């Protein structure tokens, strides 16, 4: 009743507003045919909200959606008599016990991630659940979710979970978040086939045996692990994004079987040759920094690239990088490049990292007027070229790699004094014009 809504309004002193389909950040209500309250949102209503609103809440028996997200509540005992709910938002609160969440026979969506929960037994009788958010908690075991069928989106990530076997009993899921945990065996994740997004981030996984069974995946996050063989991923070609960050891998030939992949982070590994990345013409982002690779020539056939991270690698010749034109970021610092001539055609560049190399002449990078980041620290540069002061940037002598900045550090600057070059771009220009005069 609108009388109940007004009662809640003056009790909280907050202007609840007649609104539409409820969201986790909603602070109003939703009506019905004959003006019956069904959905109510209390976003950031204080820590004492639940114990003060339950009498008005139980007064109306038509409520089916409750948003108490980010209210920082500690006790949810009042959430027991409102047996007419369907969706419940309880994000980002100091909730430890979910025992009152037992009588809510009907619930289709439960959001609980930002909490301090440790025991998920009480939600064993919640039959018709379809969405569960339980990330960033202190849980260590998941037995009670086995009885929970009809789940499509599950987020159990950020806990101390080691066994995952009961997830086998759950076969309806679409997105599975299982990360920042202590997991070693993924054998249960075999009978799943409807899964599209899998986030198996930081864990002690080294044998991706059952993922071959999955076929509809489009996003695969597998980073900060101890994996070494990616041949299992060779069969699957449907992933728009597959991230393989810090690991110990030496071969990437199985990746060459993929063709629709878009963004590829391949960082901090022992990969030797990147030739298998010669047929992925649709790559928009490539992150290959911190590896032992020598030749960039096989990468001269990916003209759709837009971001390229090649830093801290053993590349000396940059010439077979002139073919690419639609490039915007180029990080290849901490390498052994010498001349930067075969980059003058990279008209679309907007950020560069050319530091910690053996580069003496900077003059070729002159036509690249689009650069909004250039970083040449720790290089043996002797003379500063005219075009170095023709860029829309300010100059810093700091050790930080900042965008919108021309940066030098630890450089034997002889003709331009280091004090002059650390004064600023205007000082560099006046010094050079005086030298001209």
């Amino acid at each position, epitope marked *: 009743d609108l009388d109940v809504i007004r009662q809640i309004e003056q009790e909280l002193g907050m202007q609840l507003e007649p609104v539409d389909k409820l969201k*986790w*950040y909603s*602070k109003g209500y939703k009506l019905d045919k004959d003006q019956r309250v069904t959905a109510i949102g209390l*976003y*950031d209503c204080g820590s004492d909200t639940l114990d003060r609103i339950i009498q008005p809440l139980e007064s109306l028996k038509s409520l089916s959606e409750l948003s108490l997200s*980010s209210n920082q509540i500690t006790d949810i005992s009042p959430l027991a008599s409102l047996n007419s709910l369907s969706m419940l938002w309880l*994000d*980002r609160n100091q909730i430890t016990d979910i025992a009152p969440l037992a009588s809510l026979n009907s619930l289709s969506m439960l959001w609980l*991630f*930002g909490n301090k929960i440790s025991d998920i037994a009480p939600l064993e009788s919640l039959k018709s659940l379809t969405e569960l958010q339980l*990330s*960033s908690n202190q849980i260590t075991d998941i037995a009670p979710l086995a009885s929970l069928k009809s789940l499509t989106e599950l*987020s159990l*990530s*950020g806990n101390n979970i080691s066994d995952i076997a009961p997830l086998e009993s759950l076969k309806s899921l679409t*997105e*599975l*978040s299982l*990360s*920042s945990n202590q997991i070693t065996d993924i054998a249960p994740l075999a009978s799943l086939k409807s899964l599209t*997004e899998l*986030s198996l*981030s930081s864990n002690q996984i080294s044998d991706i045996a059952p993922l071959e069974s999955l076929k509809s995946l489009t*996003e695969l*996050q597998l980073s900060r692990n101890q994996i070494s063989d990616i041949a299992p991923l060779e069969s699957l070609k449907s992933l728009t994004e597959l991230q393989l960050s810090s690991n110990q891998i030496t071969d990437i030939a199985p990746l060459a079987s993929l063709k629709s992949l878009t963004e590829l982070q391949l960082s901090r590994n022992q990969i030797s040759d990147i030739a298998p990345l010669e047929s992925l013409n649709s790559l928009s982002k490539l992150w290959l920094n911190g590896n032992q690779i020598t030749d960039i020539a096989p990468l001269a056939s990916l003209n759709s690239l837009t971001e390229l991270e090649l830093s801290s690698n053993q590349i000396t010749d940059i010439a077979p990088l002139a073919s690419l034109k639609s490039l915007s970021t180029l990080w290849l610092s901490s390498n052994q490049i010498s001349d930067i001539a075969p980059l003058a055609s990279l008209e679309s560049l907007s950020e560069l990292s050319l530091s910690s190399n053996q580069i003496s002449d900077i003059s070729p990078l002159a036509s690249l007027n689009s650069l909004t980041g250039f970083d040449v620290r720790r290089n043996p540069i002797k003379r500063l070229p005219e075009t170095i002061t023709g860029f829309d940037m*300010e100059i*810093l002598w*700091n050790d*930080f790699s*900042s*965008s*919108g*900045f021309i940066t030098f550090f630890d450089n034997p600057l002889e003709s331009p004094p280091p004090e002059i070059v650390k004064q*600023g771009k205007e000082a560099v220009r006046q010094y050079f014009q005086s030298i001209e005069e």
Partner: nanobody, 116 residues
Framework: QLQESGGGLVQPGGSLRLSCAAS????????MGWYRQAPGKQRELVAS???????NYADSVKGRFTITRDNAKNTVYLQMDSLKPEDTAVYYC??????????????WGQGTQVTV
């Protein structure tokens, strides 16, 4: 990830507008704001804003820096005016939210140098 645009060398009393855009991967942003690192110091909050419209200021840049946010396109803007030379720092972006189903209250940007 959070991408920051801005920064540079500004005369004292000048102004700046640091922009911070969160990628489409970051899903449910509650708190988003700005932090600083001075040389030989520690990280300290500058500004924080929430989806509901609550602003938290550092009590040292009160009435000086302004935080604005767009929730549709998840973007924060720090409009900074009358920059005293104690602000010569590297500014970082802080956010809370979800990437690929995982929630952390502290997602950081790369940082951008502001000098006076």
């Amino acid at each position: 990830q959070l991408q920051e645009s801005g920064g540079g060398l500004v005369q004292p009393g000048g102004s700046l507008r640091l922009s911070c855009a969160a990628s489409g991967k970051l899903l449910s942003i509650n708190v988003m704001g700005w932090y600083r690192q001075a040389p030989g110091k520690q990280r300290e909050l500058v500004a924080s804003i929430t989806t509901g419209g609550r602003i938290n200021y550092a009590d040292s840049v009160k009435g000086r820096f302004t935080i604005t946010r767009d929730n549709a396109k998840n973007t924060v803007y720090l409009q900074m005016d009358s920059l005293k030379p104690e602000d010569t720092a590297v500014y970082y972006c802080n956010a809370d939210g979800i990437i690929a189903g995982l929630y952390q209250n502290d997602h950081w940007g790369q940082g951008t140098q502001v000098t006076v």
